[PDB]
Design a protein around this ligand. Structure first.
Ligand SMILES: CCn1c(NC(=O)Nc2ccccc2OC)nc2ccccc21
Ligand SMILES: CCn1c(NC(=O)Nc2ccccc2OC)nc2ccccc21
Lengths: 238, 245, 235, 240
């Protein structure tokens, strides 16, 4: 059918939506017809999200959420339920190597567990996990990226297996080197070395992540689950 | 003249093995998205069936006879398409060629040699246009036991590696190369199963059902689009959560 | 040969852990095996003595910072620094189990690394869990634990490599243990039919791989997970 | 006079044994007690192999083999059968936009050889096939492409063949080297060498002997439950 009908009738929760990849996802799910709730860690972030949605003709809301807190999670979901409805599309974009991976996976799990009750009841759902962008400094940066990706992949596949019988899919998107504020002011030598390892020869656009998410949220992705889609211009780091 | 804003309009898509099943659903999905579609089969009747199926669904294009194992068939088929329809810039390779666990070698070797032949031939046009999409379709699970697993895991491993390598080679030209790896989709093999076997098969699939051909096609249609321009070298599994390697 | 080396093997009172303890001892290491109880520890100490292996049995709870620190201090004072460390002890449930096991691996590994850093040599070898149950939940849990094991092992290897410490893992498939022994004949048969070699693995066959990874000739292997599964791959 | 060697009584065929990794594997299997047949593509290679085996006290032979030729394969194996015995340990270390043809041909060669030696293993109900992957051949994107493609084909092939032959207690495994100290790496500029080392957690190149040791373990009885596996030997440098 028509693109702006793809998600009509669905409420999407997108964490970390005030800028960058998260904002582009919020706008793309809106354009596909979802009601969109974007989150930020501050009140002004939340308000910016609400304004950006309105400016682009997307219905929904901006909210304050801290995915590391049980209380923030439970309160936020109760707010959404009462005022907008049950979020059946959930995009986790809000985030040395050990602590970071362990904490991010704990956060994914907390949020996922909380939104699954609604999806179990509806017998339908989409959980999409967004991995971290390539950039960070070092052999340490490489270590950290490969570890986070490996944890993201394994988690996503496990959770998909658990929830599959309820027609809930769980997938992940693993970005490579994407043009965000974080990557834009990386020293020129690191940026160049990164470009030289990307077959397409350019950075990815936030919108190019968002499009993949939008597809995974759609009905035609209903038999994709447990998958991690790399969006990296052909640069594979393991 | 009619200019579409967010569609495959103006693109010519070649879909090999389009007379039934997955290939046919892909041909119809790319047509619905606005491409001109050339579907192929190894026989005149398959080609005719394709041409009729396109016309019934309002899709412009053609059914052609193509044998991907033959240099002559490949070159002739591409020359024909060039002259009459234009340069195919979306190419979907879906044509591949008691099941025992020794059949993996010949099948994987023949199919990769065919993927390579076709891909090489259509790359010239994509290089010249500085745009392209090559999308390789994997083989479905062909049988229920050990041999079935062995042959499916081998074909999927060859497909993944080949796709990633080719993507690296052509990336600088803004040509993406991806693959779609199906799991269990509705087939004769699954239809002719005893009820206990069918139920045990479904119990190995987290979603609890077989996949539809259309559900493969939708993933291919996305890969062909502009918004998948940064996806390359990837193999998207479409298997309801059933992962076998 | 491992003469002159002190090896710590967690979970050594039976099965895979015990076979690893005896194998490293046969290769000449001084061996400290651990159990969660005083009787387990004592059984370990008796087994080592019966096989002529110098070392000790100790009580260790890898989930406790105090147990870890105390245990390592005990070993340092009485036997020396453990430079070969084999982690074989482990604790909708896939999440908590994996998350806790990786937290334990990390705790122990971080503690034993001081001594390896000081020696400029080390071997950490993580043992994966055997397939724990038949069918989908068993597959989910096993694949998840294996995936977390592989990624963790690779990341740690990258962090400690410059100190000539290797970090590797061994991922067993179906091994002849109490779990597989208490299976009904029909289940056992169906299981064998999914294993190309057509038999269950022996605990000793895990121990031999570990014994090799502990050796000098494995010095360029790091970050690797060796599957010991008779050709049965699940993920 | 009597020593119990872990491969005593076994005949090992090692392809590509005249230098480097293949030679170190031939010497290692010999030290472990096997009778060793090393091959090369030329008569002088073969002779060099035979001299090296003799200098190290290893029984066996150097032979000319071209793994791309059915005639050379069948003739060479028949020769070995008649004069030395059935090779029950086989180590494939011989190889020849080019990624395709190289990988595709090497896997076709592995298959030809493997198929030919399997009848003897089937008869004995015991075997070891060990496939050696290519070292990283060049710095840069093409080098990465070719290396990742070869490794991916090697892994998939090795796992499939293992599945096919498992019921006969024949194991099939691969060893995937990273950067090993040989002529290619020995002659890089100091800045490139230092940057290469900085991508290897262990901070050094691997030795040929360190690949040979892993092979020697895989050939042993204690590796009997390892099959289908690809052991990376790369100092922690993982490229895919
Ligand atoms: C947080 C520990 N961890 C994990 N996984 C993890 O924590 N959980 C996990 C991993 C795989 C599958 C399911 C999981 O549940 C968290 N993967 C890692 C990879 C590299 C370093 C650490 C990793
Ligand atoms: C037919 C031999 N073969 C090949 N042959 C091959 O040419 N593979 C290949 C070529 C280019 C790039 C990647 C490749 O494999 C992943 N790949 C296989 C994978 C699994 C089982 C057998 C395979």
């Amino acid at each position: 059918y028509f693109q702006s009908m793809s998600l009509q009738g669905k409420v999407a929760l997108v964490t970390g939506a005030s800028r960058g990849i998260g904002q582009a996802i919020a706008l793309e799910l809106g354009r596909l017809g979802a009601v969109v709730i974007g989150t930020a860690t501050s009140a002004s972030g939340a308000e910016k999200i609400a304004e950006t949605l309105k400016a682009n003709g997307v219905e929904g809301a901006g909210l304050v959420l801290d995915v590391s807190s049980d209380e923030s999670v439970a309160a936020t979901l109760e707010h959404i339920q009462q005022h907008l409805g049950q979020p059946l599309i959930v995009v986790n974009n809000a985030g040395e190597w050990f602590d970071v991976v362990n904490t991010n996976l704990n956060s994914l799990y907390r949020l996922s567990k909380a939104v699954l009750r609604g999806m179990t009841k509806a017998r339908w759902g989409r959980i999409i996990n967004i991995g971290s962008v390539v950039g960070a400094m070092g052999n340490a940066g490489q270590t950290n990226y490969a570890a986070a990706k490996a944890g993201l992949e394994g988690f996503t596949r496990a959770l998909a297996r658990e929830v599959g019988s309820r027609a809930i899919t769980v997938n992940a998107v693993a970005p490579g080197f994407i043009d965000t504020d974080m990557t834009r002011e990386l020293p020129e030598a690191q940026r160049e070395a990164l470009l030289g390892q990307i077959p397409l020869g350019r950075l990815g656009q936030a919108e190019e992540i968002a499009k993949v998410v939008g597809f995974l949220a759609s009905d035609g992705a209903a038999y994709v689950t447990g998958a991690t889609v790399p969006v990296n211009g052909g640069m594979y780091m393991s």
